Design a protein around this motif. Structure first.
Motif, mmCIF file in Angstrom:
data_model
loop_
_atom_site.group_PDB
_atom_site.id
_atom_site.type_symbol
_atom_site.label_atom_id
_atom_site.label_comp_id
_atom_site.label_asym_id
_atom_site.label_seq_id
_atom_site.Cartn_x
_atom_site.Cartn_y
_atom_site.Cartn_z
ATOM 1 N N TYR A 4 0.803 -1.247 0.000
ATOM 2 C CA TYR A 4 0.000 0.000 0.000
ATOM 3 C C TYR A 4 0.847 1.315 0.000
ATOM 4 O O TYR A 4 0.320 2.365 0.384
ATOM 5 C CB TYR A 4 -1.117 -0.038 1.117
ATOM 6 N N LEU A 5 2.109 1.309 -0.502
ATOM 7 C CA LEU A 5 2.951 2.540 -0.578
ATOM 8 C C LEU A 5 2.366 3.515 -1.638
ATOM 9 O O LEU A 5 1.901 4.596 -1.266
ATOM 10 C CB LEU A 5 4.477 2.284 -0.722
ATOM 11 N N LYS A 6 2.355 3.117 -2.927
ATOM 12 C CA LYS A 6 1.768 3.931 -4.026
ATOM 13 C C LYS A 6 0.211 4.093 -3.859
ATOM 14 O O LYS A 6 -0.208 5.253 -3.945
ATOM 15 C CB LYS A 6 2.189 3.418 -5.428
ATOM 16 N N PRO A 7 -0.669 3.059 -3.600
ATOM 17 C CA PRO A 7 -2.131 3.241 -3.388
ATOM 18 C C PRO A 7 -2.538 4.385 -2.416
ATOM 19 O O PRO A 7 -3.296 5.265 -2.827
ATOM 20 C CB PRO A 7 -2.620 1.857 -2.955
ATOM 21 N N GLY A 10 -1.088 8.177 -3.744
ATOM 22 C CA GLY A 10 -1.746 8.811 -4.917
ATOM 23 C C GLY A 10 -3.147 9.337 -4.561
ATOM 24 O O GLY A 10 -3.483 10.484 -4.859
ATOM 25 N N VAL A 11 -3.941 8.455 -3.926
ATOM 26 C CA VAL A 11 -5.316 8.736 -3.421
ATOM 27 C C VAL A 11 -5.321 10.008 -2.502
ATOM 28 O O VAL A 11 -6.080 10.947 -2.745
ATOM 29 C CB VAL A 11 -5.866 7.445 -2.704
ATOM 30 N N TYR A 12 -4.445 10.005 -1.479
ATOM 31 C CA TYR A 12 -4.264 11.134 -0.531
ATOM 32 C C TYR A 12 -3.755 12.458 -1.197
ATOM 33 O O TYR A 12 -4.261 13.530 -0.856
ATOM 34 C CB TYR A 12 -3.372 10.677 0.659
ATOM 35 N N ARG A 13 -2.776 12.375 -2.126
ATOM 36 C CA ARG A 13 -2.224 13.531 -2.874
ATOM 37 C C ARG A 13 -3.301 14.287 -3.705
ATOM 38 O O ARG A 13 -3.733 15.389 -3.321
ATOM 39 C CB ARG A 13 -1.013 12.994 -3.683
#
Length: 20
Positions: A4-7, A10-13
Motif C-alpha cells: 500500500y505505498l503507491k495506493p 496517490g489517493v491522498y495527494r
C-alpha cells in the motif's frame, strides 16, 4: 506498489489537490 505505498500516496495527494 509494495502492498500500500503507491495506493495511499496517490489517493491522498490528488484529494488534498496534489498535497498543497
Amino acid at each position: 506498489e509494495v502492498l500500500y505505498l503507491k495506493p495511499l500516496a496517490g489517493v491522498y495527494r490528488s484529494l488534498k489537490k496534489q498535497l498543497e
